[PDB]
Write a protein that binds this ligand. Structure first.
Ligand code: HEM
Ligand code: HEM
Lengths: 384, 384
């Protein structure tokens, strides 16, 4: 159920761009998402500040919306693509900017101000990482009620940054219609047909998000990071036809949840909690399962908790001739090793691996929010 | 403008599956589409009829909606994918079936029965066809209010056909959000930011579609074709960033229509008719303009109009680092030569060829409608 969902029909709804934190983390999932990574063509730190200043301006506009920028001189390219007609409605659009490890090399002199746990994504046991689709100096997470709004934001950004950014990879996706419209009531479904998001820590609870999601001042990190969040992204294909052929008994066993209800196997309500303490032979919920490995529920390692904010994607056909669909996995943590790396390490060997093929993504650090109109993305990172 | 549009929220809206004609041709445009080509694996004519019958039953149930087929024995793969949850909502699902030239080879002895104008697609000057995105024994155009329905239909069909169908290529599309919500009042906006559909011939005009779109007895064709339609699909990339950095005057010149109003150039109204005979040099509406070439509005022209029911697509990043975006272009005509072939011959070397690159697609014959529940796809074709 956390972080919730927002209606696809809310053309006029606005999500606050300005805050202590960035939007599109705790924000209830919009119906459309884009993940688009860029390589940075900035020549020096000053050129980098230009970019972040430029971005703030653009996001602030796109996010709260307005009349389209018109073209009084037809001899110039139109200042807008025109794909939303003559008005740019907010449409719950949120754009979350995050920085990759590569950004902290010789190029901009930021090495000593790197986040401590931040690293490059390296293959895991089941991975088939394609380089075309990994890493990047910056990632944008572009979320909105509709595809239009998202696609509109990109091309605006591109238009304003042609000596400044270079598109590296991109995937678009969605959350499931019925649940999108359920305004937070129903849990979104993945293309494997299982409710997905259930056990996420409550996103409304400010105090818990300080412990789980948000970088806090008690942390060994550099002080610009305070208010940011480590971000893991994994592009994961499904063997979908093979899955559709797999016994229901086997599907639930693999996840350790009831497909129809979303309850832990044995139990009756989606927000029911299993107790593995009773089940150490792993006879109700398998030790093999995604749920039990993902979280042993020891509470001794509640420290590995995270907010997962994923989307289904569906593309074309694989080289091997099969359907190309799956999860655009996205998660936020206050600490990447304590979170994503700890859980994934813990998942290596799970029964699900036979059906899933991670192929892309990267690790990134999400910036602290932009406090007011006088601030800009990573302003603390650039002074100090 | 024709064919009109349907709303994305219309979860309990249905489309008649049976009839003189199939749906998805004159049907207003739903928000989501999928073009999926299959290699037929049927070994003989008897297997083909098995297939055609099976597809009939499945579309009927899918398009008209119902409770998700319950799987009483868990030792089996689930009969439904469950990505739609408990209820398979009709959600305006239409499934349109068409056959490719390749189906009329020796395999099934239909060659003598082939439609007169049906042929393999071969390249026009500006093409960069990709073998992986061309042709197919059968093509299915699956459209619905939501991506969820359309995906669900596909997997259902696949699950039920593993000895008869093989996914050749697949592409997914959409029309602009606002236009879909307007239900016919607004022309769809394509991804170059232009109104796309305006001059489509009147699709609720009973009599007009018989001369224009449907096969009829007057034109010498195998009887079984009567009620069908020739279908031309082109997968077409847009040079998006280039277009975006092209002056608006030129954008408008190329198409010959006012970007903002969609009115013909030098006119005020979207549904205005251009006056070519007044302007033989082409000082208002260019000689190489898309509109003038595609339809020079004369006496001979009349024979070459068609119904366009195209969709936008947006994928990832091309191999060379640009945005993968374009049009899933689909049209219907009573005669393929008189229709698409004739218009594309005229379009060869138009100004737009700078900004578009056809890479896939093919020619198909869209079957007549399935008369009722006692009938099946291509029953007239197989019978004798
Ligand atoms: C391979 C694609 C994946 C699919 C289809 C998938 C799906 C699911 C499903 C259906 C659930 C149970 C409901 C719930 O969300 O509570 C779940 C739980 C969970 N997943 Fe995944 N997931 C995938 C990958 C991942 C990855 C890569 C991670 C990170 C290492 C992850 C971390 C978690 C966590 C932490 C839970 C909650 C467990 C609990 O607290 O009981 N998942 N996932
Ligand atoms: C990706 C390339 C294409 C784009 C961006 C595009 C877009 C447009 C636009 C903006 C219009 C004017 C509005 C309208 O009349 O609907 C139009 C008209 C039209 N197009 Fe295309 N189109 C493309 C390809 C094609 C192709 C391949 C054909 C068929 C060979 C075609 C046939 C037509 C026809 C018959 C019209 C109506 C023009 C008139 O009669 O005034 N178009 N298209």
């Amino acid at each position: 159920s956390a972080p919730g969902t927002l209606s696809p029909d809310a053309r006029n709804e606005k999500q606050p761009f300005y805050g202590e934190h960035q939007a599109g983390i705790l924000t209830p999932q919009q119906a459309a998402m884009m993940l688009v990574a860029f390589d940075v063509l900035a020549s020096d730190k000053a050129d980098l500040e230009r970019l972040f200043r430029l971005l703030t301006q653009r996001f602030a506009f796109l996010t709260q919306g307005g009349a389209a920028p018109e073209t009084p001189n037809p001899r110039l390219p139109p200042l807008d693509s025109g794909i939303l007609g003559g008005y740019i409605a907010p449409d719950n659009l949120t754009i979350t900017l995050s920085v990759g490890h590569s950004l902290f090399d010789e190029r901009f002199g930021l090495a000593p101000q790197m986040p401590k746990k931040l690293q490059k994504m390296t293959r895991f046991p089941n991975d088939s990482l394609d380089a075309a689709l990994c890493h990047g100096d910056v990632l944008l997470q572009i979320c909105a009620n509709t595809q239009d709004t998202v696609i509109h934001a990109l091309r605006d950004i591109i238009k304003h940054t042609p000596d400044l950014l270079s598109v590296r990879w991109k995937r678009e996706g969605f959350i499931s219609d019925h649940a999108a419209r359920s305004k937070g009531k129903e849990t979104p479904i993945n293309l494997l047909g299982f409710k997905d998001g259930t056990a996420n820590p409550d996103s409304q609870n400010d105090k818990l998000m300080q412990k789980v999601v948000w970088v806090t001042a008690d942390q060994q990190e550099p002080a610009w990071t305070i208010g940011g969040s480590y971000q893991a992204v994994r592009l994961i294909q499904f063997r979908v036809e093979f899955w559709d052929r797999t016994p229901l008994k086997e599907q639930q066993t693999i996840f350790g949840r009831d497909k129809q209800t979303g309850a832990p196997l044995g139990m009756q309500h989606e927000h029911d909690v299993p107790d593995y303490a009773s089940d150490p032979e792993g006879k109700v919920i398998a030790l093999d399962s995604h749920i039990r490995l993902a979280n042993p529920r020891t509470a001794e390692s509640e420290s590995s908790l995270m907010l997962r904010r994923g989307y289904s994607y569906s593309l074309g056909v694989t080289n091997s001739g099969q359907l190309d669909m799956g999860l655009l996995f996205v998660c936020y943590q206050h600490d990447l090793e304590k979170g994503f790396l700890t859980v994934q390490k813990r998942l290596n060997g799970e029964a699900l691996e036979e059906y899933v093929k991670p192929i892309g993504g990267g690790y990134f650090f999400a910036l602290p929010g932009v406090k007011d109109a006088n601030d800009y993305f990573g302003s603390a990172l650039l002074r100090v």
